[model samples]
Target: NFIKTISPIQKINFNGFEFYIKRDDLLGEINGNKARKLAFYIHQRYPKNQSFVSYGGSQSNALAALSIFAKQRSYKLVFACEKISTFLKNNNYALALENGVDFVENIHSLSLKQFALSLCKKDDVFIEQGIANLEAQYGYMELAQEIQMQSQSLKLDFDIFLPSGTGTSAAFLAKYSKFKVFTCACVGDIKYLKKQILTLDPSYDFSNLEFLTSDKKYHFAKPYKEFYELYMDLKLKCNIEFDLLYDILGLSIALKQEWKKPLLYIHQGGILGNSTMLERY
Candidate 1:
């Protein structure tokens, strides 16, 4: 396995409760939720070279990972996205360019989906976006098993918590993990998240997965002063720097209430992008 070993679970005292953070963020260049999402491909060996065509935001975490993935595999990566900011190039864009990923900007010229399709060649693999795909099952299932074994070894009973983009991780963790998976949708509302999971797997009832929410709704990736402050707080307390966006939302809602079982938060690292986000804040 490319992961080599299980990502460690570390205990921390935050918001007056003892919490644990799953350190999936430490999994090298293609780390965090992106690592798990693309784990199926990551763990496999291809006899021949491959090409991938995908569409997403300029600074998307998935794009950054795929950039590294393509470079490592000596594959062709054609990415479709909106305009790139000329003034301050974000971390994803910088990494993608450095890794020789071809950018196909202005997909809006034909609408993103249609443009992506138009750009696709006969051999190119098309990925709709970063989330809610069955390909991620292998990765998440392994993560679930790791958590199960780790918690058992530590003699702790804890529930899982993480922020979701399309709720893909939540669905897989709920299906595979012994503990209930708690999540909040950072990209959209709970309704959107449920629909996304169902669309990814039509038969999922989402019985063991519960959705949490923040007191105030915020646009995804739009900078907030409080979120920046929270990021700093977590860095200071945990001695670990988290991604400024989704981690803030996940940890924020998680601290709101007391739970019967102890909580373990999955750390989805996109900290490289924080430099650009900091500029905005």
Candidate 2:
């Protein structure tokens, strides 16, 4: 279900540079990253009979990923919903049920280490977040290869972009891809995001890329009416759809591209969270 969208670079407007997108939000129908990770997470050293577990926010993209995959592999899918808050109540609740994922709410009571101790089992697969194991998800790097091959076949230059959440995707580009990396923070603290990239590859330098350290705003989800209105204008004028949470942040950084390099803003889709902002600003 994953599709690639490539917008060619044109020299005429907005600092012409080809932009490429891999629509991973649609990556899996019955199996998500699990299918991509199965070869390593499943076949190599793990027990096939045991379950796989992970933790995420209420609307965790990872949980959605784990749910679909665990079922396909017939491994039990256990989720640690760390907080009792409503973050988990949105669309994921329904998906979790449909996928037959067993969720353990109120995980805050147990530390991650304690939680792991509680779930000890044979052949169990445990994937800690932050994409600690890159080789498992290197399929993402294929996106970069695809963009390079296709664009080069047509004699074009392509640049890559992605909004930094855990900065995992950004780290992928920093490590594997040859493109000029452009990134923005939609979530996660700047210190955390930077540390994530550095920890992943100590040699990876931020100086070579257009990296945005989001300002005093810690929660990227905080509303700005001007940004919302700008999103409306993009839809109405550019006929491009953008959501305030992710895309708008990309746009905010895009509009402020005072640098000379072309911009290929990575469109990490999270439009489903728009309603959450209807109350603020």
Top candidate by TM-score: 1
Candidate 1: misplaced stretches above 4 Å? 1-3, 83-91
lDDT of 2 at 205: 64
Per-residue lDDT of candidate 2, residues 34-132 (tens digit): 333332454454456468766655555556656666766777877665664665455245666788887776556767535743664655666665234
Best by lDDT: 1
lDDT of all predictions: 0.83, 0.57
Deviation in angstroms for 240 in model 2? 4.9
**Local lDDT at 248 for model 2:** 73
**lDDT for 256 (candidate 1):** 86
Could you tell me the lDDT of residue 119 within candidate 1? 85
Evaluated at residue 167, the lDDT of candidate 2 is: 66
